[PDB]
Amino acid sequence: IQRTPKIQVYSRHPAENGKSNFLNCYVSGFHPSDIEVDLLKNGERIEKVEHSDLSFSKDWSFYLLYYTEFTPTEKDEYACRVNHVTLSQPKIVKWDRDM
Amino acid sequence: MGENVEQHPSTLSVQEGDSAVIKCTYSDSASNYFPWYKQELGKRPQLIIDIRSNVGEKKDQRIAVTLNKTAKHFSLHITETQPEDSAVYFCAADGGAGSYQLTFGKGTKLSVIPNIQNPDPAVYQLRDSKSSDKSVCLFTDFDSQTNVSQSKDSDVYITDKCVLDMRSMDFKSNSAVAWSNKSDFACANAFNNSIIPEDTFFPSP
Amino acid sequence: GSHSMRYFYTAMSRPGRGEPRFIAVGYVDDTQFVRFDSDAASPRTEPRAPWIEQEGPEYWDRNTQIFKTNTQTYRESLRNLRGYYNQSEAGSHIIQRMYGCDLGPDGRLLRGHDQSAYDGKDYIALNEDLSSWTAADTAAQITQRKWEAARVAEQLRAYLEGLCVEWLRRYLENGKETLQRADPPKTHVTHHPVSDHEATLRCWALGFYPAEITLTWQRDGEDQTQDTELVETRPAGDRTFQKWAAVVVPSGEEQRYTCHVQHEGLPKPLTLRWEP
């Protein structure tokens, strides 16, 4: 049995335009462990993105935090592109500073 | 490899029915498993009891093990000793740094000297079932204080004392055998006044 | 207070893509302190918290020896489970294990754990008594027999009642300023209108530690359990956590709904209303 990943796109600290922050994409509740996760800046893949070490919840489903250093603005759009074996097509989740 | 297990005493003699105690010491704190092995003559070491670091004492019938992880020493306790308990006892600890192994003690030779209820020391002459011209000397039913010394002459052979148990009527008896190739050989030449007690029943063959 | 130490193991088979991968992560409560990954060029245990960097090279060399044993062991355990289920040597399978100890507020072994999974489903688990096992199916009953023969529960009880507890205490003292310091959350409510008649009221909580938090939207006293849109506690990425709860309320009724924030780091359970 294979589980589909839950995606959350958010910032480490409350987003203030021009102030340095961290762009976080938390993938959780998936099984098996192999997953492809990308951080997007205006529909483009961010080159230097780090991730947490593979761990899992009490229900055995895996969770991973994908993060990058970013400086938010008004005109810049941020998103997260996830692909898993349970996904027929990659799920893109847009970043909203009120989510 | 950073663990040293010391076993004391190296040898132990205990009377049948009495209690025996073997003490061991260990160096490393990574030691959390402590097995006890019993090895009978020419046979393999057999696991009799063991203890872990979360237990102070473990008892199995007559066998009991004690652990003091503060002073870093553990002990084996055998109560109501049987002559079957005679063997080499090894203790071990799984501690140390580097390569994983059981660090064993150097061993303890336990000798349970049997307790003879009614001694009837006697020297008998037993004949061959075939030749009937060949014979052997049997010194039997002697007490445990009696020692069977090797003869000075190399043409006479004397075996060591050996105890048998007749499980059916709780009868234990010590026995030693002697023989010679010299035709002139008499039982008295082997089991003489220095070995056999004064009350020895020694019939004419 | 109530603290815990947990180790999370993941052993993946990958036919044709090399030998099975073994990964291990350690945690003191909600803080990760170690990692191991057999996929590394030079596999060795690595620190993932500052209060563990002080441990000597023997400590790291000791952990690496343990995680190298598990890499060899889980390669054999993955073959055996494949055999128990009559699975092909072409498929990829996962063995997961989570074990560890709980300290009570009295600071003694409260309860110990050792659970294993196969392909994301319960396989075998050590029972509360730390003596017996619960096997999920007949395949796990083969493992149970092997583990009963090898006296694995007895081994675990000694570790959980001793070394687990002794090392957990050590990690709590060495990292007291972060592990024994509860972070209270940062509360604020936001108004985002969805329609002319209805609007969303989100109750935010940020920068708290541990991850245990209770956010409840109460309509004049009664909890709107079915009606509240609660999201999973998420990691901030700096040892802290975030969580929000949104309720779509009618434009004007904003003062009938109240949000209660429950946390360890708070002196009393907060009550919040929307601030225009």
Next chain:
Amino acid sequence: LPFDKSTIM
């Protein structure tokens, strides 16, 4: 510190 004893399943 992790458990240093492992038994194959």
Next chain:
Amino acid sequence: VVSQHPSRVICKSGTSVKIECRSLDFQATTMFWYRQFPKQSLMLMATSNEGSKATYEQGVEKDKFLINHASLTLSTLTVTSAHPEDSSFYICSAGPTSGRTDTQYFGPGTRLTVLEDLKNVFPPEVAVFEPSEAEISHTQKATLVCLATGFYPDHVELSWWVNGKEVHSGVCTDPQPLKEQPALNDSRYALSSRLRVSATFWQNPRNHFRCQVQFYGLSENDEWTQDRAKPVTQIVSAEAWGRAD
């Protein structure tokens, strides 16, 4: 349970003797190899790791003692070009738990006897001695004595078979044999044993007594240039039936 093969080996100097260590009912990632001389201690020689190189102890010649950890069930120890000083009791252990060593199960051991000349090997002569009448009337017990003589080497196992079924009650055998010529290096040994029954059990002529002495000697592949019979692994027995008076 862990086992070994062979249990006893007699070979000429310069031969390589291969000893197996097998975990019969479990998988073992590690096996330990010990050496046990008449001094009672268990001396760890090496640690066999699957499918890694063996770890040798201090003062153990990695070249004289080849260790191969073939499978999760077998480890072999090769005593390459064995000399009489390599004669020892080679015993192994394995346990189902990997990592910090836990419960270890020992094999039966391998008694290796390396001889510079294979012509000094001889089987035993077994004789059973009937009880004394003086013992029967005096104690109402009847002790039978068995004596195996002229054997070389020390490899011999004695058993009593009363009426075709093995007996352990009322039996006692010398812990170790004695040298017939206690001066030479190559001295043939003699071993004795005793079985005590009641006078009422010995007085029955239907009661059969057999003293069986299993000797471990030369093999089929071993060349024998001398005219006397090959001292192969054989059973030498002596028997006696009950006597009524």
